[PDB]
Amino acid sequence: MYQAGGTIRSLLDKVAEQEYLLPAIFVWRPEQICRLFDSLLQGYPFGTFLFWKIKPENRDSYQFYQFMQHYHERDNYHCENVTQLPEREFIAVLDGQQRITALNIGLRGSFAWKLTGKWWSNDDAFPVRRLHLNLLSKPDLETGSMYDFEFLTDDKASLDASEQYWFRVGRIMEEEEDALIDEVADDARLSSEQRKEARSTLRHLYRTIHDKDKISFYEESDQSLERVLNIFIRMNSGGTTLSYSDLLLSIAVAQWSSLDAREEIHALVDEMNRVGDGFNVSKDLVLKAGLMLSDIGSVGFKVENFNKENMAILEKNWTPIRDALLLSMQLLASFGFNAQNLRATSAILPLAYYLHHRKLTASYLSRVEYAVDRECIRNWLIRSLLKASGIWGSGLDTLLTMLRSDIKQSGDTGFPLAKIEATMQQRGKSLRFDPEEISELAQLDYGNPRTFALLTLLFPGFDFSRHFHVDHIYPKGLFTRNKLAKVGVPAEQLDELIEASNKLPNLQLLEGTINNQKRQKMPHEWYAQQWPDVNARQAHLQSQAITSLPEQLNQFMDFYRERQETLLARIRTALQPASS
Amino acid sequence: MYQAGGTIRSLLDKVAEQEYLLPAIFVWRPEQICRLFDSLLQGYPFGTFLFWKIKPENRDSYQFYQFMQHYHERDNYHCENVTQLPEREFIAVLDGQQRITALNIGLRGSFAWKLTGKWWSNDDAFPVRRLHLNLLSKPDLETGSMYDFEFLTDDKASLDASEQYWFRVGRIMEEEEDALIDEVADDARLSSEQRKEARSTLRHLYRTIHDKDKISFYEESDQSLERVLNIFIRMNSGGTTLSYSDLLLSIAVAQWSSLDAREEIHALVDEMNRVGDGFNVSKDLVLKAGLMLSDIGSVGFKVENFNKENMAILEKNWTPIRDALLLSMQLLASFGFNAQNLRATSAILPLAYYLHHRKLTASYLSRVEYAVDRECIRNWLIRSLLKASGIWGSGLDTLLTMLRSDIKQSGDTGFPLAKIEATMQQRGKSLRFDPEEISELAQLDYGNPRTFALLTLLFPGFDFSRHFHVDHIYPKGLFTRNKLAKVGVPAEQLDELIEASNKLPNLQLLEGTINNQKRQKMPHEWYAQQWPDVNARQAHLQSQAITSLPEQLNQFMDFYRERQETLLARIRTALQPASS
Ligand SMILES: [Cl-]
Ligand SMILES: [Cl-]
């Protein structure tokens, strides 16, 4: 069947009573849910959906799932199983799943994502947020946004937003339009001009969902599913549309006399990703690096930059360029980076420009004449990566072309560290750390990608190309609620000790792989038998910012505070910028 | 910038002027184009298209193509490059490519595909067809069809069938509606009752194309492209809509406790395709085989057959089922089959059923107790593949379930050939060949997949799992039109002899690979050099149905005609209905 128009309200009511379901076959980023609601209010139409009608004889023939509603990046990213399996004929959605999920999360659910820089262990790193609309939206002529939608905690919404009036979008499914419009009219915090504007935005939102025929679908049973599914694919977007990424790639490879630049680019990606313990770089990175290493004026990942003259330059230099790219990954692996602990792939671009510039080869990793230069790059890269945010995000393209001029100007004197650091300061991307950034670094968690990076900056000396790991000084296994309450730790200090045992003051770098006999002893026990000479012992331990090793867990927080103090100092000096 | 109105005629005028072009980045089956036109006349709407505007300053920055128009499976199957590049702003179509191509082929172009049973080398196996509509179509209740569209020759369109009035669709782009409707009204082929419904169907077809707003699109320049493409993708089918067959795979994987069904399917498929010199088998075949080998009542490739009860039965029997499937591929390779010469992969299903029924293993290929049985299978299979069509196409599912009962009753006595052939006969699929089929077999071309099969039937005794090939008796290279006139062949006959030189009476099976010294000699020279003893030579020529080996090409047709008669007698004997 064809249904040419239903409301979003009718659609979501069916989702609510589990009459629209999913067959057993992910979710969008919050920013994309917001772009959908903005596009919806602006008037962009939905494409048609496709629904498979399940008769009651078949309720049990197949496994069905429920549309995602309250998304939690940690605790609920999988679709929930059906709980109210209908006993009348119902629907499984074959096309429309992600648009319907976003509608459902925005209007009936929530989104809890991990805060930037925090670790999965942290429980206050996943604040629950709900979709909100700023009833006083004004056209942002940069994003093309007409309505400002945003996922907000309850308190960032309720705060006095100056010039803003935030409205929880889901209220239009819970209250009548009259009650909501009256709330806005009766709010004395709005001016009369603001009240008029808030009112027509709230009406526009309410009625887009409740009055406008936005939803169209085909609806078919088992018997003719095959035929209409084919019709549906034929007449709508059947052969999937290229993303912008894949469009640039196709346009870019079109300009190459090599009969398969597509194959050259994939071989390079997979090669790069097999380096060391594995990386995860994309073809986007390779194409942008193409633009950057060929001295193209713009490194913007934009279709206009992949015209035939620029792709002619890129093809000419493809061998130097894939050589530098591949040597960039080998440098990174030689520092200990892999796919799990490299947060910003864009940092590869200036590294690769440098290696490509000086025409370096894999001997750059061994010869001693380079060791000082290799160490200067490592320190710079790690510091850039220790920033929670604000270095390799927004503003990248202008940062990259300025860093490129600095590297160009350096001839073969080596990595131009002072110049680079000044360019970054000039751009609002200083590698200077302020005291609260320092405190944040000193409480990093085991497994956070910045943690090993920080440790290899604080305690250099290992061959980071060889095996090494981060270990707990007081083994993490000793720290459970049961075990601790019997050594006497008060019941209220129990969660404090457990959280602290997993953080930087209890962390160290160790050569080799995980030692299982170290992890079953108290640290003073383990170090007394590995270092019988009491003087060696206290020099080794001191090299690791370990002064003492209390013999009972009851005194762990004394140890923690003491080493936290030493690490704060060591972090300060390590992150202090040189001068001349 | 949106545009919800647009006629198909406007769209195709832009294609015709080369103002709608393709960016550099396959064409549908003719029956899929026909189904597009049927859906279009039934009211199924087109999804919205995405167009990228190229400003005249960038008309040279990228490579563009023209929409395909006159499709030739051999001589013109990849997009035409741009003649007549617009000097004003123009469009590259980013979404809608395939739907526009189909409109363009149906309304302004043509489709030439290889006739079933013929080979690429034959220049009269690709008759040009153009899209036609039966102005007397009536609802077909078996196909959901309402309008019968079909690609036809001018000759088969000019034929009078009881209620078949074929009208060439492209004429609505070339002539005024008045002229076309008057020709229908003036045609003594139609009764007054029929000219009313033919006029109404011609008008509906004409006006769907010229008056109705069926085309809608977004149009964007470089600047808005990224933003609007992502909106387009989010609001429409954003994830590649799953085909019916990918839906079945997903439905099926979901019901397996833990054999990790998705990659056990793909792994078995890859395994199947690497047997011998390689096959090209589909996951769809593997699923169908699951249904047949587990004795499910229906073997229809329909979603209803993949409920959890059936998938439970399949998972239990998965190991014996993949065993049987791989053994069936190994048996086929032992016959000399591969991806190129196996025309009907459905023939695998009864093979695999049989092999699974008797629980045979790899020793079935070698032990001599099976030699007679393997040869009976090979003989039956080849005969089924020697039919140009009508065996493994339509009607397959009922044939399969009946072949299954025949194999199941055969117990352990061996392949039940007589009963299988009775079954095939009552299904209208006799392995009996009539005189005109015999004559067509006696002139198959070199390279036609049926030629190798026929030869292995007529000349058994090689080790078809070791290397062998088809070779010309009088080498193919001797037969160029310059070379032939020089040995003094009359002008009239020259191309009769070139023709016949590529056909079965000049073909033989030889062990090993191509022998380049044999291909440079007249046959009688080759054989006198290889078989110095004239009596062993006559014996060996006799085994290949060679009576005489004329020494001049001038007598080649005397050889052709003599060996053709010898082959006809062998073929008539090899294909004759058997003893009972
Ligand atoms: Cl940027
Ligand atoms: Cl069938």
Residue numbers in the entry:
A (entry chain B), B (entry chain A): 1 to 25, 29 to 583
Paper text:
In order to better understand the biochemical data, the dimeric structure of BrxU was solved to 2.12 Å. The N-terminal DUF262 domain of BrxU is connected to the C-terminal DUF1524 domain by a flexible linker. These linkers entwine in the observed dimer, and then a loop from each N-terminal domain connects with the corresponding protomeric C-terminal domain (bridged by a glycerol molecule in the structure), such that the dimer is, in effect, two interlocked circles. The relative rotation between N- and C-terminal domains is easily observed from a top-down view, and generates a cleft that runs diagonally across the dimer. This cleft is ∼21 Å wide, and surface electrostatics show clear patches of electropositivity throughout, with the N-terminal domains as the floor and the C-terminal domains forming the walls. Within our structure, the position of the γ-phosphate has been taken by a sulphate ion that is bound by R102, and nucleotide binding has been prevented by proximity of an α-helix and linker from the opposing protomer that fill the corresponding space where a nucleotide might bind, also blocking S42 of the RLFDS motif. Within the C-terminal DUF1524 domain, D474 and H475 of the BrxU DHIYP nuclease motif are positioned on the surface of the DUF1524 domain to form part of the cleft wall within BrxU. A glycerol molecule bridges the DUF1524 with a loop extending from the DUF262 domain, and an additional sulphate ion and chloride ion were observed bound by looped regions of DUF1524. Despite setting crystals in the presence of AMP-PnP, no nucleotide ligand was detected in the structure. It therefore makes sense that our crystals contain BrxU dimers, without bound nucleotide.
